[PDB]
């Protein structure tokens, strides 16, 4: 329903909902969740434990147990992450990783970034940095009481996404 | 095939069970193909339908559905070929015959004592072909109507419940052939 043709912006322009940096490997294969250390450094705040629910067929009977780790960041902290993260995968590159929904994600070792290797006791190769982009009004699908779906009208587009991010430092 | 004669199962008399997910061990259905002829067309080139309609509401045996069809089907191919018009058989074999099977010969037959006693191993199935239902529905083009008519006449000597041939029409073939070209 994209209504652009008016007299526009400041509510329309994109913002960062979140950056989630998530590891998926498992326990035992590298450790407890020790690339939490590496997350800890790159992002700047502590990652939180990922448990699983549902199926595996492959070892992974324990269910409730540590297997993964994540950092959902946002404000300045997400952006500050983007700046370092944004520059490492090369550019430019590419429409395919963007969804139509207007989010984009990439992989690489935590060791990419400025950072000491020396502090991370382990490095671990890859897992999604995910960037959630959205308009101001999101708060309607998010907030509890008066949830309303986000309309086609509101929802970010890959074109819109590429533009706002391509606007900045890549 | 191995005997039980169909009169016993002819009457619409007992409660209707066709439920496959509870009724375990249910054997092969038939007819092997229900609509016979083309299948590159639907009704188009065939501006005549002929039907066989039941006078008598009854349970018709699964093999009788094949037997009535096969006599009709050779008349179709032996007088109008492989990829001709299209016939449809339109009542199908819902009614699972459980019913006493496998008798023995002591002073037991009924093996446990005399009993017998449901959880019977299944024998076959019948179709409920009720009054005025269209058992066979055949779309044809007019010169070959008389060919479908002998084929329906051969069909009726091979099920129990008496039927009449009719050239079938809903909106004629003469409100269709107006209403078609009035809204284009």
């Amino acid at each position: 329903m994209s209504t652009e043709k008016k007299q526009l912006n400041p509510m329309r322009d994109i913002k960062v909902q979140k950056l989630v940096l998530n590891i998926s490997v498992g326990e035992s294969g590298d450790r407890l969740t020790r690339a939490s250390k590496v997350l800890e450094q790159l992002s700047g705040q502590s990652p939180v434990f990922s448990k699983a629910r549902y199926t595996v067929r492959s070892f992974g009977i324990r269910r409730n147990e540590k297997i993964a780790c994540y950092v959902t960041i946002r404000g300045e902290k997400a952006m500050q992450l983007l700046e370092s993260g944004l520059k490492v995968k090369e550019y430019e590159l590419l429409r395919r990783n963007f969804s139509d929904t207007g989010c984009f994600g990439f992989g690489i070792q935590e060791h990419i970034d400025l950072g000491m290797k020396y502090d991370p006791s382990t490095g671990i190769y890859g897992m999604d940095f995910f960037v959630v982009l959205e308009r101001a009004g999101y708060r309607v699908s998010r907030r509890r009481r008066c949830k309303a779906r986000v309309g086609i009208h509101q929802r970010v587009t890959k074109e819109d996404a590429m533009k706002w991010f391509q606007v900045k430092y890549e | 095939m191995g005997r039980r004669p169909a009169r016993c199962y002819r009457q619409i008399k007992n409660k209707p069970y066709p439920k496959s997910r509870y009724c375990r061990g249910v054997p092969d259905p038939k007819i092997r193909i229900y609509d016979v002829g083309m299948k590159k067309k639907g009704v188009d080139e065939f501006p005549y339908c002929v039907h066989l309609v039941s006078w008598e509401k009854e349970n018709v045996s699964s093999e009788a559905l094949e037997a009535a069809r096969i006599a009709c089907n050779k008349y179709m191919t032996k007088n109008a070929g492989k990829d001709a018009f299209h016939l449809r058989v339109r009542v199908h074999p819902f009614h699972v015959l459980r019913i006493n099977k496998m008798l023995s010969c002591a002073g037991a037959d009924r093996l446990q004592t005399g009993m017998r006693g449901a959880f019977g191993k299944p024998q076959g199935t019948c179709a409920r072909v009720d009054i005025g239902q269209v058992l066979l529905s055949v779309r044809c083009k007019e010169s070959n109507a008389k060919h479908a008519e002998e084929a329906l006449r051969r069909a009726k000597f091979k099920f129990p419940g008496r039927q009449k041939i009719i050239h079938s029409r809903k909106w004629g073939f003469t409100k269709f052939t107006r209403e078609e070209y009035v809204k284009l």
């Binding site: 907030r143 509890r144 009481r145 008066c146 949830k147 309303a148 | 009704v43 188009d44 269709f176 209403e179 078609e180 809204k183 284009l184």
Partner: protein, 304 residues
């Protein structure tokens, strides 16, 4: 074509449907829970409704006293923080002191001593006080209970200040003190236990003295000056106004009013049928043409 979203709804209609008539407009809007509603309503104590978030929020608050009847609920009194500057006050209408005073204003307004029928003894006013742990006479609460609505039991919080303004207002509302916004948390004086501060009117006072630029008109004591004017006794309002001209009106209302069906569906259908017979391509949603004349009918004639 493909396509998602619509298609996974329009087929599974019957489900839809059910989703809109399981609950109605205040739940569809997402406003009122009908399990908290039932907890609080069954007894005839009235609902002491105090809204404050995704509603009226970050700007004003309201307290309403609601009873049941055959027609619908029925508010017996209400107070809005926007009426609170009438009694002199001009500092912020969303804060703890505003909420506190808005609850007194509803509570003073509900007795106000009404109707022939009266009631101001044993002992309304319980002053604009300062306060300690609820002094009543004293043991049984009735004719108001707190309907927090969507708003939380979050320990030491502004819904409780509204509740405290009810209590020091001559309403008696049920209580025990173990998540509550106690005494100084309006401001008042305080404090005890595992929860903390021992200031909160007087919030902003602590802040303001940590220097920086913000709102005009001073300081910590300006809570005290016009909490003190809201300690005075002075029922009741609202209001005197001139009524009302003719008619309705309004330029917004007008460029919206009124009706138009039938006729307008007939003008639009005429436009559609003329648009078809002058071209023939697609209809409205989504397909057909060869060659039509409205509506369900056209599709049946384009098969055979």
């Amino acid at each position: 074509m493909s396509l998602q979203g619509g298609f996974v709804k329009t087929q599974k209609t019957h489900a839809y449907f059910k989703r809109f008539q399981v609950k109605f407009k205040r739940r569809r809007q997402g406003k009122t829970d009908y399990r908290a509603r039932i907890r609080l309503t069954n007894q005839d104590k009235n609902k002491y409704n105090t809204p404050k978030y995704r509603f009226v929020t970050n700007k004003d608050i309201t307290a309403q006293i609601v009873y049941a009847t055959i027609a619908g609920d029925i508010v017996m009194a209400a107070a809005y923080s926007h009426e609170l500057p009438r009694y002199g006050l001009e500092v912020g209408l969303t804060n703890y002191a505003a909420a506190y005073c808005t609850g007194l204003l509803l509570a003073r307004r509900v007795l106000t001593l009404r109707g022939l029928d009266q009631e101001y003894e044993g002992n309304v006013e319980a002053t604009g006080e300062d306060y300690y742990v609820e002094p009543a006479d004293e043991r049984r609460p009735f004719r108001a209970l707190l309907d927090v609505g969507l708003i939380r039991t979050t320990t030491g919080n502004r819904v409780f200040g509204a509740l405290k303004g009810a209590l020091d207002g001559g309403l008696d509302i049920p209580h025990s003190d173990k998540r509550f916004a106690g005494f100084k948390k309006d401001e008042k004086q305080l404090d005890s236990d595992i929860h903390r501060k021992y200031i909160y009117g007087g919030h902003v006072a602590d802040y303001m003295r940590s220097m920086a630029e913000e709102e005009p008109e001073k300081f910590q004591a300006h809570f005290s000056e016009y909490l003190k004017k809201g300690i005075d006794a002075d029922g009741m309002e609202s209001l005197y106004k001139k009524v009302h001209a003719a008619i309705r009106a309004d330029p917004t209302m007008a460029k919206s009013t009124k009706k138009e069906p039938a006729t307008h569906k007939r003008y639009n259908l005429k436009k559609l049928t003329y648009e078809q017979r002058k071209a023939s391509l697609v209809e409205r949603l989504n397909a057909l043409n060869s060659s039509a004349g409205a509506d369900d009918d056209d599709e049946e004639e384009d098969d055979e």
